[PDB]
Design a protein around this ligand. Structure first.
Ligand SMILES: [K+]
Ligand SMILES: [K+]
Ligand SMILES: [K+]
Ligand SMILES: [K+]
Ligand SMILES: [K+]
Ligand SMILES: [Mg+2]
Ligand SMILES: [Mg+2]
Ligand SMILES: [Mg+2]
Ligand SMILES: [Mg+2]
Ligand SMILES: [Mg+2]
Ligand SMILES: [Mg+2]
Ligand SMILES: [Mg+2]
Ligand SMILES: [Mg+2]
Ligand SMILES: [Mg+2]
Ligand SMILES: [Mg+2]
Ligand SMILES: [Mg+2]
Ligand SMILES: [Mg+2]
Ligand SMILES: [Mg+2]
Ligand SMILES: [Mg+2]
Ligand SMILES: [Mg+2]
Ligand SMILES: [Mg+2]
Ligand SMILES: [Mg+2]
Ligand SMILES: [Mg+2]
Ligand SMILES: [Mg+2]
Ligand SMILES: [Mg+2]
Ligand SMILES: [Mg+2]
Ligand SMILES: [Mg+2]
Ligand SMILES: [Mg+2]
Ligand SMILES: [Mg+2]
Ligand SMILES: [Mg+2]
Ligand SMILES: [Mg+2]
Ligand SMILES: [Mg+2]
Ligand SMILES: [Mg+2]
Ligand SMILES: [Mg+2]
Ligand SMILES: [Mg+2]
Ligand SMILES: [Mg+2]
Ligand SMILES: [Zn+2]
Lengths: 122, 134, 135, 105, 86, 60, 52, 50
RNA sequence: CGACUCUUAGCGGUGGAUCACUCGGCUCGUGCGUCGAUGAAGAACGCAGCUAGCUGCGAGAAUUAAUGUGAAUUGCAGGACACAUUGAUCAUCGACACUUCGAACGCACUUGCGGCCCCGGGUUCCUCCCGGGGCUACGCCUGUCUGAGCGUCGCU
RNA sequence: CGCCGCAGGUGCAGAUCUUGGUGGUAGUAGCAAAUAUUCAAACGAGAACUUUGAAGGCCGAAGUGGAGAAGGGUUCCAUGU
RNA sequence: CAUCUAAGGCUAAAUACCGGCACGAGACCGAUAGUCAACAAGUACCGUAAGGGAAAGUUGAAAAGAACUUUGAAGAGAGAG
RNA sequence: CGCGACCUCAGAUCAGACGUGGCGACCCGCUGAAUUUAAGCAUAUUAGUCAGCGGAGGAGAAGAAACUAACCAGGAUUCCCUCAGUAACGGCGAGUGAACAGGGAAGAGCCCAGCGCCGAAUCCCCGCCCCGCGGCGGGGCGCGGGACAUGUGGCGUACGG
């Protein structure tokens, strides 16, 4: 009767929030049972509900993040959390375009005097 | 002998890898030979020990031809528990005696889809080796 | 010059080190001007500097800075070198023209102190005992 | 203290030498690493000569070595002119050229 | 008396816990930590105590971000990719 | 009597108890225990009884 | 670490140790005195065909 | 004292929760090698840092 | 005769030497050679059914997802888990998330106090109260807007 | 472990040596500043010291009383050992 | 007479590496040794603070870790296993 | 006697960016002792070393001669062997102390300013459309803004052009 991540992804925001609410009221009831003695079966269910709550929340967060990435795809300016986080040093270096572009003087030399493949006899 | 310069022959390192091994490779460490009939039926020699396969102890106090079903694979202690491999303690109850899986032979395999996949996996590699060294 | 910053001119030690006045800083005032411009503008890169006038108590210099992250600099070759991380704070490592003059670099018999790239490099090489495997 | 006959010795060990000692235990590893780089470079320039560009014939400078001939940095521009090779084409076909060498004879 | 009797009058704390570094070296009256120099931007560190440096150097704590960087480096800091769906 | 989050104030405790127990409260008294947890004494409105509320909460 | 672990031996020394070692390997008394059980070996400068 | 700041009180709270005997079941764990809480602190023997 | 004392031996204490062992070091070598305002290092506080330390983790808290793997975890209990209308555990880790201090960033801290813009509730629009969300540091570059000057001018 | 070679962080009674352990001293010095205890009972295996009652005393309001600041940090309160 | 052309700029390789990630090895040390740290070690503890800083490895193949009887209030014993 | 242009300044939670702090074995720039040796000690030595401050990167620095030489000449930098415990410095005492040539490892060269020519040929930003996403580029369009003649770009730099 447990909840999985795969079957949660087809659901829409309304019932995912509904699913999360039902787990929260159940966890609070389990926490009440823990204080008033309860039973070992109810104590062991505390972890199960807690991971179920984490399971629902991560699907909501992943679905939201995926939609936001789709919404901002192709736009010039993106939120910082949607931009790549390689490394502070790596985000400051020249991109591929300005790393390989050359001056007209440089490409004239390469066109006129390209490196030749050659061999020498003994 | 060992020629690969990236695998160590250091005794302290090998012992450290063995006693601190994660459970998913402790399973591979806790492998057992198959019986002659099983080694002939499947083209495989050894097999990681499984929960519900039945073995006979071949070394120790509990040696014999009696076939006992494995009841626990307790990887933290590198031992398995078998049905009738047990002893009495002081207060009269029985406790299973853990023995190393390398000291049993598997007479019968608990067969599911995953074991059969591994069984033909091992046999196919052995057959390739046989036809490579033919 | 550079007054030694000791309380009451007391340099506790041998008489050869008693000097407090008539002492001189190793780097020029132009290097100090580049250092102060670079430190305040930490996001820029010091290129060079020149002299624009002096008073009896002040020398005035103008320092050329480059914004390494501007597209006009970033998209132009022959100015892309200043954008590399190895070229940050040149004036604080003596890599500008003014800062280089104090390092004693050069070619020939007048500059034997800096063979290897610096005084340290020459000193370390000349004061390291090479203990070969076979001696 | 001096003791009988001997050589007046002046060791240069007054300068905390033990903190700057260069051992050579990586010498065998260094020879291996350069040899791998040599072999990798030769494979990269597959038909081109492994050692590199042709170097000129050069007479050693001083009166101790001026009977001996060695290889120089690169061929002079005057050498290339009368050989009919452009100074910018030569480096593309394995001819080393030294713009700052003149030919006195 | 400079000894036992004088020790009875100490009831005013010179130092308190420091919000940076978490040590009890924050001089209340000087408003400066004697261990890290908290109000100063840069950490207090001296080469005449190599033993003090190793106590609070990188790796002595949790290294929450750095552990991930060391793991992420082994795959070239890949992002926007997932393991191929099963 | 409740054990609440240490960052929750009296207004937040008042709203929290109101919606997830459907009761009305008169006042909330708050202290922080020596163990670090925050304890709230939530006095219910006169028309509500704290005994049957505790009964249906499950802390009898 | 700079204990001078290595020793250089003159090349003529080293070649002359090899020659002595080779010459001793053809004498039964010396090979037996190393305990090599050359009891039934046909001939001690023992040579086999290139097929090996 | 009675007048205390929140940080001091929170600091005292943590020092109070961790000054407890080890649970008995710990010795039953495989490869335990722990006999007792060696970091037990009594208010009268040793004083807290602050 | 016994006590006492001394020597030696047997046995028993006290003590932890010796010996054997070694998931630790030390040294050398190799390949990589990667932190941070997209919030680092460090610190604090919390997080387990039973859990103090260590370890791991961050209110999704001794972990979520994903992928590999393939029946465990284990001190006890509990409940899962057809291993196919998909799966224990472990490993990996590229998705998500990541409390408070800290370069630490609204101002200030051995305390506390603001301001602006939205949203919800008591209001039943007008702005008071409560809650939620987003902003509010310094320096500096390009550009923008708004300006200052008995600075230099032009026209009237 | 023997033998042939090789190499050392290779031999202890001392250094008011370092660390650890143990003696005689020795059942010794000592458990002597601020007047003081006694009777009966209870619990309890066990009472000079706990509790209750009775008696005799002391602090004598500038207290050996009742409450705070600093500092301590759970020492507070019940039950049990 | 020779030689170069300052007071502007860039540039890989050969070179360095007692910090870091991941490895391999050793005529090294073997729990007073070897890192301070083989272990809940920069921990316990000390100092207002800067800072100082330990001790501490080994049942057994397997807990099979002594059921049960008996004396004692128990610690602790005698049997038994 | 206001309105404009420019110049020099100012404010903004203005649009978009960047710096700070950590580590620091190796590297770069400064600052910089004394113990010690000299059988005392002050110059000297320790030592441009310890400590102190700043700044980087996977290496850094250096580097393509205002060089070495004096030869029948070599030819950027860096590292190794040697030169060489030498030339030289030094209460010429104690002590200190390179370089060139030679042999190797590696080997790679270049760009501006200026002088000139070319209708500023140049560059940044903002909107629109298309090809793409994977660090955000390419193409086309704008009587769209700005920078710039107080000088952008192409050619060209001593080896001459
Ligand atoms: K001094
Ligand atoms: K120690
Ligand atoms: K430690
Ligand atoms: K000399
Ligand atoms: K223009
Ligand atoms: Mg040009
Ligand atoms: Mg002197
Ligand atoms: Mg005094
Ligand atoms: Mg209150
Ligand atoms: Mg006290
Ligand atoms: Mg004995
Ligand atoms: Mg998972
Ligand atoms: Mg105040
Ligand atoms: Mg005007
Ligand atoms: Mg010795
Ligand atoms: Mg002795
Ligand atoms: Mg006595
Ligand atoms: Mg007495
Ligand atoms: Mg009285
Ligand atoms: Mg009182
Ligand atoms: Mg009490
Ligand atoms: Mg030790
Ligand atoms: Mg021992
Ligand atoms: Mg007792
Ligand atoms: Mg002297
Ligand atoms: Mg003397
Ligand atoms: Mg003296
Ligand atoms: Mg230093
Ligand atoms: Mg910095
Ligand atoms: Mg460089
Ligand atoms: Mg340079
Ligand atoms: Mg030139
Ligand atoms: Mg000589
Ligand atoms: Mg000197
Ligand atoms: Mg070569
Ligand atoms: Mg031009
Ligand atoms: Zn601090």
């Amino acid at each position: 009767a447990k909840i999985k991540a795969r079957d949660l992804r087809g659901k829409k925001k309304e019932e995912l929030l509904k699913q999360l609410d039902d787990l929260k009221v159940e966890l609070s009831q389990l926490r009440v049972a823990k204080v008033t003695g309860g039973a070992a079966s109810k104590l062991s269910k505390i972890r199960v509900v807690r991971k179920s709550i984490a399971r629902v929340l991560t699907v909501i967060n992943q679905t939201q993040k995926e939609n936001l990435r789709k919404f901002y795809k192709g736009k010039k300016y993106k939120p910082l959390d949607l931009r790549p986080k390689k490394t502070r040093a790596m985000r400051r270096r020249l991109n591929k375009h300005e790393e390989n572009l050359k001056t007209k003087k440089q490409q004239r030399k390469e066109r006129l005097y390209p490196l030749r493949k050659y061999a020498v006899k003994a | 002998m060992k020629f690969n310069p990236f695998v160590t022959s250091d005794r302290s390192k090998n012992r450290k890898r063995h006693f601190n091994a994660p459970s998913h490779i402790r399973r591979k460490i806790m492998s057992s030979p198959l019986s002659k009939e099983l080694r002939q039926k499947y083209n495989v020699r050894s097999m990681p020990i499984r929960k519900d396969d039945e073995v006979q102890v071949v070394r120790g106090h509990y040696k014999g031809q009696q076939i006992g079903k494995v009841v626990q694979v307790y990887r933290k202690k590198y031992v398995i528990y078998i049905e009738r491999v047990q002893r009495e303690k002081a207060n009269g109850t029985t406790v299973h005696v853990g023995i190393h899986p390398s000291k049993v032979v598997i007479t019968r395999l608990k067969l599911d889809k995953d074991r059969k996949k591994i069984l033909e996996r091992k046999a196919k590699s052995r057959q390739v080796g046989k036809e490579k060294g033919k | 010059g550079r007054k030694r910053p000791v309380p009451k001119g007391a340099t506790y030690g041998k008489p050869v080190h008693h000097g407090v006045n008539q002492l001189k800083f190793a780097r020029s005032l132009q290097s100090v001007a580049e250092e102060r411009a670079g430190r305040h503008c930490g996001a820029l890169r010091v290129l060079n500097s020149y002299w624009v006038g002096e008073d009896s108590t002040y020398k005035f210099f103008e320092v050329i800075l480059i914004d390494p992250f501007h597209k006009a600099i970033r998209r132009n070759p022959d100015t892309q070198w200043i954008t590399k991380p190895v070229h940050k704070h040149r004036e604080m490592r003596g890599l500008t023209s003014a800062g280089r003059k104090s390092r004693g670099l050069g070619k020939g018999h007048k500059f034997h102190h800096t063979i290897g790239g610096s005084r340290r490099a020459a000193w370390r090489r000349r004061n390291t005992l090479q203990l070969h495997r076979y001696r | 203290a001096p003791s009988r006959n001997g050589m007046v010795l002046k060791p240069h060990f007054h300068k905390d030498w033990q903190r700057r000692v260069a051992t050579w235990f990586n010498q065998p590893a260094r020879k291996i690493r350069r040899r791998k780089a040599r072999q990798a470079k030769a494979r990269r320039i597959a038909p081109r000569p492994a050692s590199g560009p042709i170097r000129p014939i050069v007479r050693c400078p001083t009166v101790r070595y001026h009977t001996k001939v060695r290889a120089g940095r690169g061929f002079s521009l005057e050498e290339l002119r009368v050989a009919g090779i452009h100074k910018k084409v030569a480096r593309t076909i394995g001819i080393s050229v030294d713009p700052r060498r003149r030919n006195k004879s | 008396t400079k000894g036992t009797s004088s020790f009875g009058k100490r009831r005013n704390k010179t130092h308190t816990l420091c919000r940076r570094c978490g040590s009890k070296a924050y001089h209340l009256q000087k408003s400066t930590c004697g261990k890290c120099g908290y109000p100063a931007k840069r950490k207090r560190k001296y080469n005449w105590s190599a033993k003090a440096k190793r106590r609070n150097t990188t790796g002595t704590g949790r290294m929450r971000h750095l552990k991930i960087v060391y793991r992420r480096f082994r795959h070239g800091f890949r992002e926007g990719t997932t393991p191929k769906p099963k | 009597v409740f054990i609440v989050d240490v960052k929750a104030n009296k207004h937040q405790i008042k709203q929290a108890v109101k919606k997830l127990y459907d009761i009305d409260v008169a006042k909330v008294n708050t202290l922080i225990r020596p163990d670090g947890e925050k304890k709230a004494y939530v006095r219910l409105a006169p028309d509500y009884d704290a005994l049957d509320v505790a009964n249906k909460i499950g802390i009898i | 670490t700079w204990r001078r672990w290595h020793r250089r031996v003159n090349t003529t020394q080293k070649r002359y140790a090899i020659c002595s070692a080779l010459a001793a390997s053809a004498l039964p008394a010396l090979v037996m005195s190393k305990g090599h059980r050359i009891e039934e070996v046909p001939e001690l400068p023992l040579v086999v065909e290139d097929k090996v | 004292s009675s007048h205390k700041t929140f940080r001091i009180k929170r600091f005292l709270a943590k020092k109070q929760k961790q000054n407890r005997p080890i649970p008995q079941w710990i010795r039953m764990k495989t490869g335990n090698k722990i006999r007792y809480n060696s970091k037990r602190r009594h208010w009268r023997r040793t004083k807290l840092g602050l």
